[PDB]
Design a binder for this molecule. Structure first.
Ligand code: CL
Lengths: 172, 180
């Protein structure tokens, strides 16, 4: 079962290759049992609970945590308190980038407005023939693809005047 | 008004199955290698495999897989319909690609036959699987000497075990199950 470090990088590179068909979803319109303490995400999930809609990623890149004494030349994303170094595909193995960075914005009413508690990334999403737009209602997706990673968090309310920028880093 | 969030998302069970399916898709360029001609410090207790390894120590040769299939451990009360194999101390149920997610097959089964002198004879202590192996030019043969490989590809998983001896009269059937 002993996989190499490079096996994880290979898996991350494989996800990045699916960029043209990678979408970030928002869901869970209904309240958690405890709104202040969301339950831990169960890996057996094949999709989001009460999926609202799908949004094509603004950015998808391989990455790795910054070293303590490193002054990075490459771009950095500063997720609250911890810095990540974005690595181009060619330096994947040399940099040991076994993590994947994903970013997407939910601008106003492009998807139905309301509360949401879930964020997840799907690869190989089939938009119904005749649709190119990055914002897809669940009735507009032909086959949701494969839910790769998701997160359960405290509710956020979205209005036609609100732009929600959702970004996350997943280890592979 | 604008909202900003940065979080720690966990991989799904299906993400592991997807990774295993991705390796199976590389079947045409997947090779099993054998190595470590020299004895371990303690021949009876081999050292734990270091994941930072990019290849095998004293690589002997590369042999294209006889079988590569997705699999999962057999359940305690299961009487499997599908084919079964033995690795570690357990039994594994071989699952076809179509039933990958339904069966939750996040493990990969690989098998290769090392028939006699097709690769240099002697003792070996390592077994590893490589994907995207480039044979020098347009060569087709399944048995490749390290001097015959143009680019070894990506060492996906390997094992350190007690020695096995191969002679021109011996056929070694190496099987291993790796979790993804
Ligand atoms: Cl939270």
């Amino acid at each position: 079962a002993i996989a190499t470090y490079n096996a994880h990088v290979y898996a991350a590179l494989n996800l990045k290759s699916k960029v043209d068909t990678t979408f970030m979803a928002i869901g869970k319109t209904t309240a958690w049992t405890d709104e202040t303490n969301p339950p831990e995400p169960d890996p057996n999930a094949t999709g989001l609970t009460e999926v609202i809609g799908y949004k094509k990623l603004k950015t998808m890149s391989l990455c790795r945590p910054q070293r303590t004494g490193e002054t990075p030349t490459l771009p950095t994303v500063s997720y609250g308190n911890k810095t990540w170094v974005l690595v181009p595909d060619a330096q994947a193995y040399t940099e040991g980038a076994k993590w994947l960075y994903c970013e997407a914005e939910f601008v106003g009413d492009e998807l139905p407005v309301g509360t949401y508690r879930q964020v997840g990334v799907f690869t190989d999403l089939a938009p119904k023939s005749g649709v190119t737009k990055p914002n897809l209602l669940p009735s507009e997706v032909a086959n949701v693809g494969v839910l790769q990673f998701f997160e359960n968090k405290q509710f956020q309310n979205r209005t036609p005047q609100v732009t929600a920028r959702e970004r996350f880093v997943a280890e592979l």
